[PDB]
From Swiss-Prot, chain A:
Subcellular location: Cytoplasm; Nucleus
UniProt organism field: Saccharomyces cerevisiae (strain ATCC 204508 / S288c)
GO molecular function ontology, one term from the record: structural constituent of ribosome
Domain of life: Eukaryota
Keyword Cytoplasm appears in the UniProt entry: yes
Encoding gene, per UniProt annotation: RLP24
Keyword check for ATP-binding: no
Protein name per Swiss-Prot or TrEMBL: Ribosome biogenesis protein RLP24
UniProtKB/Swiss-Prot annotation, chain B:
Compartments where located: Cytoplasm
Highest taxon in the source lineage: Eukaryota
Organism in which the protein naturally occurs: Saccharomyces cerevisiae (strain ATCC 204508 / S288c) (Baker's yeast)
Chief location category: cytoplasm
Glycyl lysine isopeptide (Lys-Gly) (interchain with G-Cter in ubiquitin) cross-link, renumbered residues: K28, K125
Protein name (Swiss-Prot/TrEMBL): Large ribosomal subunit protein uL3
GO MF term set: RNA binding; structural constituent of ribosome
From Swiss-Prot, chain D:
KW Nucleotide-binding (keyword) present: yes
Lineage: Eukaryota, Fungi, Dikarya, Ascomycota, Saccharomycotina
Protein name, per record: Nucleolar GTP-binding protein 1
Binding site for GTP: G174, Y175, P176, N177, V178, G179, K180, S181, D220, T221, P222, G223, I224
Domain of life: Eukaryota
GO molecular function: GTP binding; GTPase activity; RNA binding
Domain OBG-type G: from-to ranges: 168-322
Keywords: GTP-binding, Nucleotide-binding, Nucleus, Phosphoprotein, Ribosome biogenesis
Function: Involved in the biogenesis of the 60S ribosomal subunit.
GO terms under biological process: assembly of large subunit precursor of preribosome; ribosomal large subunit biogenesis; ribosomal subunit export from nucleus; rRNA processing
GO cellular component: cytoplasm; nucleolus; preribosome, large subunit precursor
Other remarks in the entry: Present with 28000 molecules/cell in log phase SD medium.
Subunit composition and interactions: Associated with nucleolar and cytoplasmic pre-60S particles. Directly interacts with RLP24.
From Swiss-Prot, chain E:
Any GO MF annotation of the entry: translation initiation factor activity
Protein's name in the database: Eukaryotic translation initiation factor 6
Reported function: Binds to the 60S ribosomal subunit and prevents its association with the 40S ribosomal subunit to form the 80S initiation complex in the cytoplasm. Is also involved in ribosome biogenesis. Associates with pre-60S subunits in the nucleus and is involved in its nuclear export. Cytoplasmic release of TIF6 from 60S subunits and nuclear relocalization is promoted by the GTPase RIA1/EFL1 and by SDO1. Also required for pre-rRNA processing.
Subcellular location: Cytoplasm; Nucleus, Nucleolus
PTM description: Phosphorylation at Ser-174 and Ser-175 promotes nuclear export.
Source organism per UniProt: Saccharomyces cerevisiae (strain ATCC 204508 / S288c) (Baker's yeast)
Extra facts: Present with 18600 molecules/cell in log phase SD medium.
InterPro entries reported in the protein's UniProt record: eIF6 (IPR002769)
Keyword terms: Cytoplasm, Initiation factor, Nucleus, Phosphoprotein, Protein biosynthesis, Ribosome biogenesis
Subunit architecture: Monomer. Associates with the 60S ribosomal subunit.
Family the UniProt entry places it in: Belongs to the eIF-6 family.
Length: 116, 341, 124, 421, 225
RNA sequence: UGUACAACGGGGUAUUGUAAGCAGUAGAGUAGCUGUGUUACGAUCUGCUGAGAUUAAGCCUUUGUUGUCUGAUUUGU
RNA sequence: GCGUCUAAUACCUACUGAUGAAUGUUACCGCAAUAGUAAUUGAACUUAGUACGAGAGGAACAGUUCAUUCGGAUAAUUGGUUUUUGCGGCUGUCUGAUCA
RNA sequence: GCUUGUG
């Protein structure tokens, strides 16, 4: 099983959900619920839609770049199985979830300061 | 249409009684021939398909399964049957004297108006020095050749706006009927867990009333739906437990998310008690009582002997085009919002 | 041969996905399968070239559909579809007549036709 | 297929064909009619029955004609073979009779269809239908002898050898069963007896073998002394594009003298001497050497008691007919013994293991313990691949111990300052 | 060493399996006899692993590589990659390659020392192949066919080039690879030798339909004996 | 007359998509005061604002507010 | 029994549906005389390149895996489908002006 | 108390 961010909305694409498009350019475009796929069919730019993650990241509504983003890179070269490595990765992911939540909360607080 | 299922009249009652029971033997331990449950929505399942000779051997297969609530069932009585030229005849019935309020309500159409005298006199009679019950048990044991145990579902443990319990007879598949009544003595007022009867990878058949529609237009008008239907070769994928976490977890996913979809099931509540997961669909809509049985026959085929390898269970919100599996994941992906602060 | 979503109508014209000199295929037969008949990805169908060199015109030849363009449920759950209908021409034994196949090639079709996969440069 | 004719359908005996056709037309066509039926309805009923019977007869005759090949147009060699096995004129007569019977049946059916339309009574139409059916039956019965002849010739044509005269081949010839029968029995899988009596073989036995990966076929001549067998052998020697291997006997085998063999060879010499002849022999030998004087014949003494030498003769005949940075090999490969399919000590292949467990059917093989690891004790792992909605493969990598420490240090460098406020 | 085999009554051996001087890969088809066919001629000398690419039985033509390492297309799932790594010795490198196309086996024709790829292949793909596999990369085509990987086959002892390859092209390829090259057919006149058969420095596998002349030509060109 | 139920409200899940209004240096274009030269009008843009609205008439939950719990008839070995 | 390029294309009664007096009342459970009855055809690895066969060609059962047709069911994912006339925008456009 | 295959 694999999970990929929607090409349009960047939302997670769980197995058996959404739809995929194979244009003549021969690359996989993963899509979330129909709404965004139909929006893509209209050639709408996700970087300009107010309600999509791409615009928010580009517009700076949420933290555009963070150190935590580099830890979620899909490794290309395979790695030999190791139970200790699996457990350490699970612990690291558990800690990274909390760290990312804290950083996102801090960024949101630093963005809502304009309400004062 | 199929002439076999004609006539297409409506079912006699919401609950479809078991037409036949699995063959009986006098060597195996006593066990329940069938169990009662309630249809609870549907969900997707993805797992590796270990099947010799198949094109997708050792591959991943995505398929849909239904979820049926199966709260622990409690025994309330036993019915004995003697053999006669005119078929089986019920000679006597017994009760445990501790009938719950739910089963008492089943005998009344207007509970609040009633004085609630369901088993007061019977309860007093049972409270004698065993003469009024031991004699009946001995008579049942002496003559009865097959023993059926009366049980009902704990409706109070189900998120349904119905206090009325469902009472149906359950047959025993063996046990040297002397030992059948001995086991019944040891199970009066007790509850039988789902895991103590059924198990994963076991092939079972389901009998229930399918979705009804009403008047509908053999080139003639008539009733459509709401008929008893039996579906066989239904594989049990996951056996749920209502006394532990990780109900929806797997050795692969190993997440602490419950099987209940985000926001709850559509037109149904939340599954917290014991539940059963079977591939395909059962002929019955949501909030519908269903019964399970072991196919009435010994299934030695590969589809039966094969062992499931559940990898991941979908729990996204069936309410609309749900995408997030757990509230924590949604919060992490979406982040804090004006609602939080 | 696992079931896939059909939808190709009889008489449909699909682009020729090989450099054999043809550009379209006129499907007139659903040979190899048992009501309104229809073709599907990976199915061998006899067709006649409508647009192309005169040599290939008016003669029925076998063809294999490499693209359907209609949404179908893959056995792995993920739904996918192509941009347009396409097919390739080959002999009844599966030997690809075209030297090379162009455009996307269905994974399900390539798996069931090893010769097509060999001559197919773009799987999926 | 020009080299075989086993596809011919079996011919139906005189009575069998008529009975089969009558039953077929009776079963398919309607059967119940009444005198009160409309005249047009009875007309259509009888016309349909007669037409169906006629079409059945025509189809049977056409199938018989199509199956049986035209002797003239098959091949000169096959034509001569058939003319030796049968009579060309008689066979053509039978074919013409079949064609004429089919044409007469067609004409009678058409005429009766054109005639029955003017009947008045039901019995008149019934009598006309009986007339057509009886005419067809009489026409069929007139072919009682040719039908049997066709059946007999079909029963034999289907078992004739399918030789290809165009491809390279070798012919063995000589006096009846001088020993060439043993030569054929040892040069090819073909099993032929070598009994001492003259005509041990009564047909052109054929066998195939491969030399230098080139396909070769050999034909065993029954014998040469006129007779039909002798004519067939002569035609096979002449028409076939094959060399002829004459057989002789230095011993008393077959009870024939060398002089008789020499005389026969000289008598038949003119029509095969130019085909690259070879002579095999199983103080009169001086006269036998006179054959060496012929430019195109060579002789080599031998015997059937040492039939292991047939390979040398085969090789000679085939040659005469035709003339007319270091690699990376692991040391393990160069050390492991080659697998022996029958050695009791041979390693048990995965095929045997699967068969013992139940084969590729009821039993499914497992890949556990097959993959290498640092430790084999913990081989049993599930590889969750997912955790809290995040793919493990996006985090499964070495050195994570230092990355986690660095991340914790970075978090500590901000928690103390309360930057998250 | 030359052996005749068929995978589930299929003649295309080079499609259902990938074989090299250091490892061998076969499909996961229900017919295990295909694995036993390779085991008989190889045994435990080199690892033989059941594997697939995106669940396909065409792993042979979906992947390309040499003794130094193996390459897989983007369609290969991470689970398949980790299974291959676990089942493949660490001495052999594994590296996923991303391209518009997916058929790496048809697009890359290479041996233990040289590689021939699609002229318009990804720019970084040539560097990745040179690094992981340690072989030269040449943007060239043989027999006027774009799919060099399937049409042609290369090894260290020799190479069976397309039967229609010109004499000049054969001479140039032999001078570049420093190994003999001869044009011929396989699998009873099958022009796509690479898909029909696989070959290494010490073993050759061909379809059952392969006629005796084709087997002799394969033995001679690769100098097995 | 109590895990009783109804109507609202809150929370959970979803559809759509950034609201009425406020302030601004971001500001087409017109006027004045000849080089954001300056200031009024002012198409739009920016932050509040993944904000606002809907949310069961056949979704889930309920601790919060609040109301109800008695109207006639029939049935006998 | 089942189909008929594929293995092959030789004005009232009846009706399905739904009420309904009855026997001491009501209610729960169960048996079944009875009327109907269903699955269907092919391919795919085996066994096989074995038996057979000079060759060309090429068996079958036990077991396993798939698809067509016909029937009973489900919206778990996708499409259809919208008086949720839900949301946002827009056209003519009125409440004097702007929201609504 | 008609009808069905051999001029």
């Amino acid at each position: 099983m694999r999970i990929y961010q929607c090409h349009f909305c960047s939302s997670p694409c769980y197995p058996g959900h959404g739809i995929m498009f194979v244009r003549n350019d021969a690359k996989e475009f993963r899509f979330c619920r129909s709404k965004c796929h139909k929006a893509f069919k209209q050639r709408r730019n996700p970087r300009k839609l107010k309600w999509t993650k791409a615009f928010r990241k580009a517009a700076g509504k949420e933290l555009a770049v963070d150190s935590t983003l580099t830890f979620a890179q899909r490794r290309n070269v395979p790695v030999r199985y190791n139970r200790e490595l699996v457990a350490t990765t699970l612990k690291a992911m558990a800690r990274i979830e909390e760290i990312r939540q804290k950083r996102e909360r801090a960024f949101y607080k630093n963005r809502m300061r304009g309400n004062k | 249409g199929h002439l076999g299922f004609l006539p297409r009249k409506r079912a006699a009652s919401i609950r479809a009684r078991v037409k036949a029971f699995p063959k009986d033997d006098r060597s195996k331990p006593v066990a329940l021939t069938s169990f009662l449950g309630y249809k609870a929505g549907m969900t997707t399942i993805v797992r590796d398909l270990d099947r010799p000779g198949s094109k997708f051997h050792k591959r991943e297969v995505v398929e849909a399964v239904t979820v049926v609530d199966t709260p622990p069932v409690v025994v309330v009585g036993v019915v004995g049957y003697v053999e006669t030229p005119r078929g089986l005849r019920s000679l006597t019935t017994v009760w445990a004297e501790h009938l719950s309020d739910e089963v008492k309500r089943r005998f009344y159409k207007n509970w609040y108006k009633s004085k609630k005298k369901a088993f007061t006199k019977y309860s007093a009679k049972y409270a004698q020095d065993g003469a009024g019950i031991e004699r009946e048990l001995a008579r049942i044991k002496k003559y009865a050749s097959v023993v059926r145990v009366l049980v009902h579902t704990q409706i109070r443990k189900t998120p349904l706006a119905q206090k009325k319990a469902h009472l149906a007879e359950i047959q025993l598949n063996g046990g040297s009927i002397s030992e059948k009544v001995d086991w019944a003595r040891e199970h009066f007022e007790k509850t039988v867990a789902v895991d103590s009867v059924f198990e994963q990878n076991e092939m079972i058949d389901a009998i229930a009333v399918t979705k009804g529609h009403g008047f509908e237009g053999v080139a003639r008008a008539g009733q459509r739906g709401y008929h008893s239907r039996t579906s066989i070769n239904h594989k049990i994928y996951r056996v749920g437990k209502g006394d532990d976490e990780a109900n929806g977890a797997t050795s692969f996913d190993r997440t602490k998310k419950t099987i209940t979809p985000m926001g709850g099931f559509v037109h149904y509540g939340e599954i917290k008690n014991d539940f059963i997961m079977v591939k395909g669909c059962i002929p019955g809509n949501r909030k519908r009582i269903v019964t399970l049985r072991k196919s009435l026959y010994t299934n030695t085929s590969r589809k039966a002997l094969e062992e499931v390898s559940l990898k991941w269970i979908d729990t996204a919100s069936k309410f609309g085009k749900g995408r997030f599996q757990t509230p924590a994941e949604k919060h992490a992906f979406m982040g804090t919002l004006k609602k939080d602060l | 041969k696992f079931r896939i979503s059909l939808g190709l109508p009889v008489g449909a014209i699909m682009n020729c996905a090989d450099n054999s000199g043809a550009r379209n295929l006129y499907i007139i037969a659903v040979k190899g399968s048992g009501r309104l008949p229809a073709a599907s990805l990976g199915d061998m169908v006899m067709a006649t070239v409508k647009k192309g060199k005169p040599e290939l015109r008016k003669k029925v030849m076998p063809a294999i559909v490499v693209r359907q363009a209609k949404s179908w449920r893959r056995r792995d759950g993920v739904f996918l579809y192509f941009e347009d209908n396409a097919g390739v021409i080959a002999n009844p034994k599966g030997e690809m007549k075209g030297s090379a196949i162009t455009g996307p090639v269905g994974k399900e079709c390539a798996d069931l036709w090893p010769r097509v996969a060999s001559n197919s440069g773009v799987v999926v | 297929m020009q080299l075989s004719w086993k596809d011919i359908p079996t011919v139906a005996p005189a009575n069998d064909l008529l009975d089969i056709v009558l039953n077929r037309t009776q079963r398919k066509t309607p059967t119940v009619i009444r005198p009160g039926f409309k005249i047009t309805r009875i007309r259509a009923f009888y016309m349909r029955k007669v037409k169906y019977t006629g079409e059945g007869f025509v189809e049977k005759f056409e199938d018989i004609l199509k199956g049986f090949p035209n002797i003239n147009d098959v091949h000169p060699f096959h034509r001569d073979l058939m003319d030796t096995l049968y009579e060309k004129n008689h066979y053509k007569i039978s074919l013409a009779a079949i064609s004429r019977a089919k044409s007469l049946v067609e004409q009678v059916a058409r005429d009766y269809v054109r005639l029955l339309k003017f009947g008045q009574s039901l019995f008149q139409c019934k009598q006309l239908k009986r007339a057509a059916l009886g005419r067809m039956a009489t026409i069929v019965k007139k072919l009682r002898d040719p039908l049997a002849y066709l059946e007999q010739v079909r029963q034999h044509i289907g078992r004739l050898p399918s030789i290809d005269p165009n491809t390279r081949t070798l012919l063995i010839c000589g006096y009846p069963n001088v020993g060439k029968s043993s030569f054929l029995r040892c040069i090819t899988k073909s099993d032929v007896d070598v009994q001492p009596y003259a005509f041990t073989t009564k047909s052109l036995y054929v066998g195939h073998f491969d030399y230098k990966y080139l396909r070769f076929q050999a034909i065993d001549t029954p014998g040469i002394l006129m007779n039909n067998i002798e004519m067939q052998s002569i035609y096979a020697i002449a028409h076939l594009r094959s060399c002829v291997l004459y057989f002789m006997d230095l011993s008393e085998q077959c009870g024939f003298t060398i002089e008789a063999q020499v005389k026969l060879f000289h008598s038949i010499k003119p029509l095969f001497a130019n085909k690259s002849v070879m002579v095999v022999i199983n103080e009169r030998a001086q006269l036998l050497e006179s054959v060496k004087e012929v430019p195109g014949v060579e002789i080599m003494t031998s015997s059937c008691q040492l039939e292991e030498n047939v390979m040398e003769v085969r090789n000679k005949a085939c040659e005469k007919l035709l003339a007319s940075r270091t690699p990376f090999i692991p040391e393990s490969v160069k050390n492991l013994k080659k697998y022996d399919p029958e050695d009791p000590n041979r390693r048990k292949l995965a095929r045997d293991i699967e068969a013992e467990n139940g084969g590729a059917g009821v039993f499914n093989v497992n890949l556990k313990d097959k993959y290498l690891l640092e430790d084999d004790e913990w081989k049993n792992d599930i590889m969750p691949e997912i955790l809290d909605g995040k793919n493990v493969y996006d985090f499964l990598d070495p050195e994570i111990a230092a990355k986690l420490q660095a991340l914790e240090e970075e978090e500590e460098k901000l928690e103390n300052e309360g930057f998250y406020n | 060493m030359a052996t005749r085999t068929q995978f589930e009554n299929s003649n295309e051996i080079g499609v259902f399996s990938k074989l090299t001087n250091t490892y061998c890969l076969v499909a996961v088809g229900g017919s295990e006899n295909f694995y036993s066919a390779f085991e008989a001629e190889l045994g435990d000398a080199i690892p033989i692993v059941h594997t697939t690419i995106a669940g396909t039985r065409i792993i042979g033509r979906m992947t390309a590589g040499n003794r130094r390492g193996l390459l897989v297309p983007t369609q290969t799932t991470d689970q398949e990659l980790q299974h291959l790594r676990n089942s493949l010795p660490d001495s052999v490198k594994i590296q996923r390659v991303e391209e518009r196309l997916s058929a790496l086996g048809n697009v890359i024709c290479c041996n233990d020392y040289v590689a021939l790829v699609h002229p318009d292949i990804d720019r970084e793909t040539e560097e990745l192949i040179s690094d992981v596999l340690g072989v030269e990369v040449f943007r060239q085509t043989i027999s006027g066919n774009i799919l060099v990987g399937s049409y042609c086959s290369l090894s260290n002892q020799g190479g069976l080039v397309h039967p229609q390859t010109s004499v000049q092209d054969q001479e140039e390829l032999s001078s570049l690879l420093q190994v003999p090259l001869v044009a011929g057919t396989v699998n009873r006149g099958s022009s796509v030798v690479g898909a029909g058969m696989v070959v290494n420095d010490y073993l050759a596998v061909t379809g059952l339909d392969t006629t005796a002349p084709e087997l002799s030509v394969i033995e001679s060109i690769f100098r097995l004996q």
